[PDB]
């Protein structure tokens, strides 16, 4: 019923680098979604306490959010684009698992995911 600690956004042992693809993921993908009108619920870890959702972290064991993603990218936490794309996918999957089809938050996620897939289509090959 507490929130869990947030996902780590830096690790002193994990190697860093910034690929052209990782730059694109921060400067195009993350930024386009971050600025979207529906972005706020996804801009930080789900606060199950403030939202009064005591079963959220009983159901969702791999939480992820764009604030974590953004910090990870800003910190060169990822080694490759696939790691970061996986975190976006996890973020969307979590929302669909926990919520019902037709919920406002699911419609918001579906909107962001459509934009995400469109921008990943232009990831530098
Ligand atoms: C569940 C869930 N699953 O995944 C995610 C992600 C969530 C989730 C849901 C709402 C989440 C979330 C996270 N973070 C947030 C923001 C942080 C937040 C946390 C707790 C909180 O507490 C107050 C209520 C105290 N409690 C006690 C009720 C107030 C604010 N909000 C709230 C964000 N608004 C955005 C607007 N929309 C609806 C709308 O107006 N347009 C949608 C248009 C498209 C249809 C309703 C949710
Ligand atoms: Na570039
Ligand atoms: Na996805
Ligand atoms: Na569900």
For residue 46, the domain's CATH number is 1.20.920.10
Helices (H) and strands (E) in the chain, counts: 6, 0
For residues 89 and 32, what is the distance between their CA atoms, to the nearest angstrom?
16
Asked if residue 8 is part of any domain, the answer here is no
Is 88 touching ligand 1 by the criterion CB < 6 Å? no
- Please enumerate, as own/partner, the contacts of 49-58 that have beta carbons within 8 Å and a separation of 24 or more: 49/1, 49/2, 49/3, 54/1, 56/98, 57/3, 57/4
C-alpha 81 to ligand 3 mean position (Å): 14
95 touches 68 (CB < 8 A): no
CB atoms within 10 A of CB 33: 23
Name residues with Cβ closer than 5 Å to ligand 3, which is an ion.
Answer: 89, 92
Asked if residue 87 is part of any domain, the answer here is yes
Residue 113 tokens, joined? 């995911």
Helix, strand, coil tally for the chain in percent (to 5): 55, 0, 45
Lookup result for tokens 């600690």: 5
Domain count, the chain: 1
Q: How was this structure determined?
A: X-ray
4 touches 63 (CB < 8 A): yes
For residues 31 and 34, what is the distance between their CA atoms, to the nearest angstrom?
5
Asked if residue 40 is part of any domain, the answer here is yes
Atom of ligand 1 nearest to the CA of 53: 1
């Amino acid at each position: 019923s507490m929130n869990p600690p947030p996902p780590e956004t830096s690790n002193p042992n994990k190697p860093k680098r910034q690929t052209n693809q990782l730059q694109y993921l921060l400067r195009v993908v993350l930024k386009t979604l971050w600025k979207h009108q529906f972005a706020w619920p996804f801009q930080q870890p789900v606060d199950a306490v403030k939202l009064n959702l005591p079963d959220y972290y009983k159901i969702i064991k791999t939480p992820m959010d764009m604030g974590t993603i953004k910090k990870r990218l800003e910190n060169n936490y990822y080694w490759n684009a696939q790691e970061c794309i996986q975190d976006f996918n996890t973020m969307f999957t979590n929302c669909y698992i926990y919520n019902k089809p037709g919920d406002d938050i699911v419609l918001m996620a579906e909107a962001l995911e459509k934009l995400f897939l469109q921008k990943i289509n232009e990831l530098p090959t």
